Amino acid sequence: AQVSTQKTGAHIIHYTNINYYKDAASNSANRQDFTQDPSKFTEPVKDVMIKSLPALN
Amino acid sequence: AQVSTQKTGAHIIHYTNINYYKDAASNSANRQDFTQDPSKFTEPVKDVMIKSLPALN
Amino acid sequence: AQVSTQKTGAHIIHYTNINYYKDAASNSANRQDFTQDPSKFTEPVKDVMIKSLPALN
Amino acid sequence: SDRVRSITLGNSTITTQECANVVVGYGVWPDYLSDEEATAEDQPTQPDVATCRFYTLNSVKWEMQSAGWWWKFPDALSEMGLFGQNMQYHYLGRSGYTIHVQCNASKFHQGCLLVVCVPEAEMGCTNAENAPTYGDLCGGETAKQFEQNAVTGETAVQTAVCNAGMGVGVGNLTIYPHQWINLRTNNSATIVMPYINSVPMDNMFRHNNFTLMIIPFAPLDYVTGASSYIPITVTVAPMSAEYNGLRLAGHQ
Amino acid sequence: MGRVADTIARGPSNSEQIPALTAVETGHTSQVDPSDTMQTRHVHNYHSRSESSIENFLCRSACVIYIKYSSAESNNLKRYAEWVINTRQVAQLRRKMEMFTYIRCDMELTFVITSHQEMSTATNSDVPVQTHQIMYVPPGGPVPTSVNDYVWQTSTNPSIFWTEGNAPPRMSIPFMSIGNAYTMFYDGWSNFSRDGIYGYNSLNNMGTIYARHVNDSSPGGLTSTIRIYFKPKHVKAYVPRPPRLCQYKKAKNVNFDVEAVTTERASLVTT
Amino acid sequence: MGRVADTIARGPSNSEQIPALTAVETGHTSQVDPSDTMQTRHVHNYHSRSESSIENFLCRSACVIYIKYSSAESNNLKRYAEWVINTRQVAQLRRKMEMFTYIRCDMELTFVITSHQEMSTATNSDVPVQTHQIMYVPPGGPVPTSVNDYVWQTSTNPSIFWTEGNAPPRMSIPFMSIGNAYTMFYDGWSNFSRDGIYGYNSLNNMGTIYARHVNDSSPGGLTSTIRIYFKPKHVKAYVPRPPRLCQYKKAKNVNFDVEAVTTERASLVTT
Amino acid sequence: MGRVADTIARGPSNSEQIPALTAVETGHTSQVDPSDTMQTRHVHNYHSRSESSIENFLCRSACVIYIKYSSAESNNLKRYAEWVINTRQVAQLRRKMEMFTYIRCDMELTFVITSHQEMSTATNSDVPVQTHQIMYVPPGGPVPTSVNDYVWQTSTNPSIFWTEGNAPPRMSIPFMSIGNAYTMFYDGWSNFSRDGIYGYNSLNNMGTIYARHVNDSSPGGLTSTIRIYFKPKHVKAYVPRPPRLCQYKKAKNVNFDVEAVTTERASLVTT
Amino acid sequence: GLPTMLTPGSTQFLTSDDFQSPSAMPQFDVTPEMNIPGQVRNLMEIAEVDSVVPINNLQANLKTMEAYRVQVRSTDEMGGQIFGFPLQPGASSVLQRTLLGEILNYYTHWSGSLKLTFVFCGSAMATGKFLLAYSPPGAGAPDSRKNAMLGTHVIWDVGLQSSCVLCVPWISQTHYRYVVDDKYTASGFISCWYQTNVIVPAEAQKSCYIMCFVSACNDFSVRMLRDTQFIKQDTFYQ
Amino acid sequence: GLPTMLTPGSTQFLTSDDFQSPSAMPQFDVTPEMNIPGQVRNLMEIAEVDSVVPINNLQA
Amino acid sequence: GLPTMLTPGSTQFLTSDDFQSPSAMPQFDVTPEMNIPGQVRNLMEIAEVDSVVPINNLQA
Ligand SMILES: CCCOc1ccc2cc(S(=O)(=O)Nc3ccc(C(=O)O)cc3)ccc2c1
């Protein structure tokens, strides 16, 4: 059994999941992975550009 | 698992709940919260009025 | 309860099985046994033949 | 200053004295394939400096009514040096690139270009029952041209910048590795594309990993009595080129 | 968590720092916050990007086709139906996946199978509850040519048997591309010549679904229609693309008709 | 626990203490017990206020609408039905919520879907078990204009598929107001001008439910009627209001007709 | 795990080692890798032989027969049906098992039972939901001669009772050969004389399935058809054989018609 | 068996559920993962990237490249308003087919600040100053440059740095706004004015262009998935 | 599967039940709570407040 | 009984599933195993064995 926090607010709060199958494709979708890395689209530059400085010196 | 007392009389008496979902909106309603504070409607006065004393001295 | 790894990739990942019957013929098929021994068909020779050497000296 | 740069690859070197940084597409720098991501079991040839080195393509004339240009890769380098020779003799290849666009002007000229490398830039067709043919997708070292307005044909590529030749907003080609060349700022763009595919290696004639598109977003304009010929030159070097599946030359 | 940035308190400034000024000739886009362009208070911000994950965006079941078949063969539907698997015959699901160039995912296939009575010159109908088979035939398998043939024995072919009046049946499918991700857009050809099929349809070869009534035909006629629903699960997506601007024409091409960027306005200044 | 106060034993008194006398010109209301106005015994009192919690009061499913649709389109019901979500078309559920000004809660939506045979000139009916779709379309989504259109593909729109002869289907809905609580009464307007819609209907924008038969029409006709039930859960309510005195007129206004405070009596003294 | 061998890096060679040269006059087959015939790089290889196990190959349900029976006895189907148990009346399942000489396994039997209305001169049908019995009679048990006889009391005979509109019924069967494995091919005879039945049918004696409607016949007619599905489980197989080349003729013989080894080519050199 | 009781929604197919279901290819061995550049994990990694904004989307300019550029010139007066549009990044004609705006039309709610970058695409001998303004709503769009500078603004000075960002802050009564236009959820107005003039030599062009870009800030989020209204079909594609 | 048996009231919709049901907006992020004056938790906080009584409720 | 809810695919017969089902011969005593030469455990033990190739497969 895997016990993991629920999505809850803002200002019990766990659920239990047991996998019933021998394949990991059978498992319920992972909806609680909230990792991000926007910098490879938003800042894809060789030299690190500091915000307060000129872009082009 | 959460083990909590049942509603019972007056002059076994527990139940077990396991949450099966990843959201807290999916959970059964909280019916056993009996907290109160009637004083913000019933006594909403700046100065504390003592019952035995005059209201207005 | 028997807890065993699921089939998963490549570069949670366990499941739980409980048997509900008194016979082992009632059980789900064993799909995760990957033992092999091809040498009794592929190399069924009395004298061990070393690959780098002549077959017949 | 941040405006001066050199890039040396092989026996070639490029210099800039106005540039707006270098874009490393998706933050990943070219490298050879690892042993844990491989699937071709023969030894890879890595010609190093002999294939990795700038190759200047045919220049295009920027006009006031130009709507843009595109070159598909690896098929713009298919006749270029030993990079193009190793394409002939090998089933598989795999290469990253540094793409460098040059377009200088005076300070009395104005215009703005989008320089963008689009992975998997599959293109539409004028007739909706037909696929575009190779001659209309690719010109080799010569660019194929976008048109201002819709075109007709049977196997012609539907060209019309607004759709970008792909049926999408042309203004949204900015989630792809890109730089702008604005004539009042910089005279060069540099993009470094890693190898991007969903297979670790692939044939170099049957597939185009990305397309470089150069699209005017602010027309060329200058007062008559100034230079009226302004080229755009694209000079592009392979990086970490390696090939597997050696056999006789051809591709049919 | 997926919680967003807090606003940071900021006072008056007068310095040679220039967060507002930038060059967009770099591929880099500005990182400015409100805390760089005006006063601002501190706001502790609890908002989350939880539902804007790609595994919540793509993880809702979408109809990809429906196909009909008839016991009577009333209106040219045969006694079985077929569908070459693809995701490109529906606009809505297709567009969501085409915001990415490569996707690897598992699928979950749910089937919503319904039947209806047909007009007939038959009198007296008391037709039993229908059972239906849904058979998946991997590439290069034998195919039905009739409802009665040997291919419906399903000796190695995956198959569902389901009876009406029950919950919709579903099965998971794993990731199963030849490649290391599914390819939404292919700028190549299927030949080294550079002829043949061009586009993503070169790499499409995902088998065929067949569906029949298992029950023998009754004196009236029933047509059954099966709607197929795919839900991505366990997704990783790579290389973002623009959302589509143009309406699609074809399920094997991207061919498009030239369409407007945006809708009209009266002038530059509107209120 | 929610247990009430015990009565406290009290003897004769004669003092300058005056619990009975008070001024009601204060907003304060008297705190007097029986133990202040007469003798009284000690009563250990075990009674609870358990079921008078707001999370037991509001937490019973109440019908909020029903809407009808017909396979034949017999009596102008179309082949699908629609309902703009609100809680104000029913007197009973509305009144309970309007004893509060602001409520934040989760909902639980249960649907009770029934069908009936219609008069027809058709002969011989043996219509399969109906399947039905219930689609929720968030604000600014595409809407059905027919039963067959692309909107019922439900690629991102939440949807239920359910077959007759099974348990009523239900789904939870979370709290989802733009504000930090739902607003039962709004004394404002939707314009800064102070024109347009006035009242709580300014802030109402909760999407639209659509429901259809998924099965193709059969030679007779069936009308299906779907009854929608909302149950508040996990409630916090704020700012108590009087219960309604007057009957409602409209589901978007509070307009009312002038009505009596209480019922008649013959005189001041009645037995 | 079932993971396959990695490729090992290899340089130029020039030695008296000869991995390529071998004699095939030995029963031994060469063990050469690519790392013996050309350069090669190191490839860490994660591919698995997981689904090529014999317990995944044989472990998918395959139809082995279907048999029909009729309430009315409309078209000579009687009121009950029978089938002498064997695995050899279907090509697909038979071929998979005949790639082995001896197999011991447990089975899982699933039944897919359907019914259909028949033509009749009857008017007004409102036939209740059918119930069906499936009775297994071990060798040397009493057998049905009618639908009403004493044999359907099932006092020791294993039996399933199942009603339409429910999930397909299944039961496990254990390994149950007289021998220590089932025999797919028997090169003997059933007599010491060397007469009588020749082949594997000598050792076949696996009882008989009988199936009837449990409900009494109604004024119309219903035919029910029951499809029987066997899935091997817990398998051990011994002595690999060639897959079949020829189509089968008979379910008790291997008799075959002479057929081509492979399909045509134009010449020795083709592209 | 074990005593159980079925509860409402026992046989439903909800399209937003996640449940486990048996695989139809048991023990299938998937292809190994490899690193493919540009992995997306969130759609706010697409929304925070700049996208050219069609601020000149008049009827003639829709299918041309005129859409994405607004002319600015050397005026003989002060010069008036250059453009203005109601802010609403998912319902405005200007902003709703950008990357930010098409990721917004899969959602019903949004919150947070966004940033409008502007770039001068004149000559390097051309120079100007512009007032980039945001006005919170409840007093209409500014009809003078005086009323525009009572709002939030950045005065842009054209120089070596070719671009200037007007970051437009969240400023809202509610924690979220609707993607759809709603009068309660009104989001303000954007405008641009001449602060000085475009001043340029004789031998350099009097007219120049300006482009606008839009992207989300790092405080931006969206809620409540829904079908987009921008794609449709009348029959299955073949 | 696991042997189970259904008991009376297996498919009923009781309107006073409380059971769990899947959310139709999985992973939805609700608005933060704030303190709104005058939170009610019980209806005996409304009943214990004075209310003017119509003791002269004749027809006119 | 215990509150439960049925989910899609509750009554399906998938032919590639593996589930437990009651035996129809409870407490049946199977024949002892013995070693039979040539046990196969994988079909890559058959595929790795040489097989004569018809490279001259013309019509005659
Ligand atoms: C009777 C002859 C056939 O008539 C029509 C009429 C209208 C059609 C519209 C479409 S669509 O909008 O492109 N796609 C849909 C997908 C799924 C659903 C569903 O119901 O889930 C609905 C529509 C497809 C086929 C159509 C056939």
Side-chain angles (χ1 to χ4, degrees), chain E residues 7-20:
Chain E
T7 313
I8 309 301
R10 140 84 175 241
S13 294
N14 183 3
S15 55
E16 296 183 64
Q17 302 182 298
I18 41 160

Side-chain angles (χ1 to χ4, degrees), chain D residues 101-118:
Chain D
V101 179
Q102 302 100 282
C103 183
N104 56 268
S106 60
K107 293 187 179 297
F108 295 81
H109 289 195
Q110 55 179 59
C112 195
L113 298 168
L114 173 58
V115 177
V116 56
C117 294
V118 176

Side-chain angles (χ1 to χ4, degrees), chain E residues 66 227 229, chain F residues 148-150 152-153 212, chain H residues 233-236:
Chain E
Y66 59 81
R227 286 165 167 76
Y229 289 82
Chain F
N148 300 119
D149 72 346
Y150 67 101
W152 299 106
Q153 292 173 9
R212 61 166 181 158
Chain H
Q233 47 169 192
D234 296 346
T235 192
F236 295 124

Side-chain angles (χ1 to χ4, degrees), chain H residues 72-221:
Chain H
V72 66
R73 59 182 294 270
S74 183
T75 54
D76 295 350
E77 292 76 54
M78 175 56 71
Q81 196 169 354
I82 309 189
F83 52 85
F85 46 91
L87 187 60
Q88 47 197 244
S92 186
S93 303
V94 177
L95 296 169
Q96 65 187 167
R97 303 309 304 257
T98 66
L99 290 168
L100 178 59
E102 290 176 300
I103 270 56
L104 278 163
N105 283 114
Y106 279 109
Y107 295 86
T108 309
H109 299 306
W110 66 281
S111 56
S113 305
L114 55 100
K115 36 187 163 65
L116 297 167
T117 309
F118 297 92
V119 59
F120 188 74
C121 299
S123 303
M125 287 288 169
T127 187
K129 292 183 169 60
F130 302 107
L131 176 71
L132 305 168
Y134 166 61
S135 296
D143 64 354
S144 55
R145 191 180 71 187
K146 176 175 178 181
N147 288 350
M149 55 73 65
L150 297 172
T152 286
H153 61 92
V154 177
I155 298 176
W156 174 16
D157 182 17
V158 175
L160 178 58
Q161 306 314 296
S162 192
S163 302
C164 185
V165 189
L166 169 65
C167 186
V168 30
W170 172 234
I171 316 177
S172 186
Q173 24 66 254
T174 34
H175 283 59
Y176 292 86
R177 277 174 172 136
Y178 300 100
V179 168
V180 291
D181 188 16
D182 180 20
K183 297 302 296 77
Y184 178 63
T185 231
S187 186
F189 303 94
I190 299 295
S191 52
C192 184
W193 301 78
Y194 292 85
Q195 182 62 18
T196 307
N197 188 23
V198 179
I199 301 299
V200 61
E203 300 297 349
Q205 288 289 357
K206 300 305 183 65
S207 297
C208 302
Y209 285 102
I210 288 175
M211 307 189 294
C212 181
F213 302 85
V214 65
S215 52
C217 297
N218 59 358
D219 58 5
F220 196 100
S221 56

Side-chain angles (χ1 to χ4, degrees), chain I:
Chain I
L2 180 67
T4 52
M5 192 184 79
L6 301 182
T7 59
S10 55
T11 57
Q12 70 184 0
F13 162 36
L14 175 59
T15 57
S16 303
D17 65 12
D18 59 340
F19 293 126
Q20 303 178 55
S21 49
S23 191
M25 298 80 175
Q27 305 312 298
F28 186 93
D29 185 14
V30 302
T31 314
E33 289 186 58
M34 69 181 191
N35 291 259
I36 302 176
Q39 182 171 355
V40 189
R41 301 177 183 77
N42 210 272
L43 300 184
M44 299 287 98
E45 300 173 3
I46 300 180
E48 285 185 293
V49 185
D50 281 352
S51 183
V52 201
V53 177
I55 69 295
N56 184 18
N57 55 357
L58 312 181
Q59 39 61 249

Side-chain angles (χ1 to χ4, degrees), chain H residues 3-13 19 22-24 26, chain J residues 1-10 12 14 16-19:
Chain H
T4 52
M5 192 184 79
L6 301 182
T7 59
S10 55
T11 57
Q12 70 184 0
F13 162 36
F19 293 126
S23 191
Chain J
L2 180 67
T4 52
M5 192 184 79
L6 300 182
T7 59
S10 55
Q12 70 184 0
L14 175 59
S16 303
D17 65 12
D18 59 340
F19 293 126

Side-chain angles (χ1 to χ4, degrees), chain E residues 256-268:
Chain E
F256 79 90
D257 288 348
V258 172
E259 285 169 56
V261 167
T262 32
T263 47
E264 298 174 61
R265 291 198 298 148
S267 54
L268 291 168

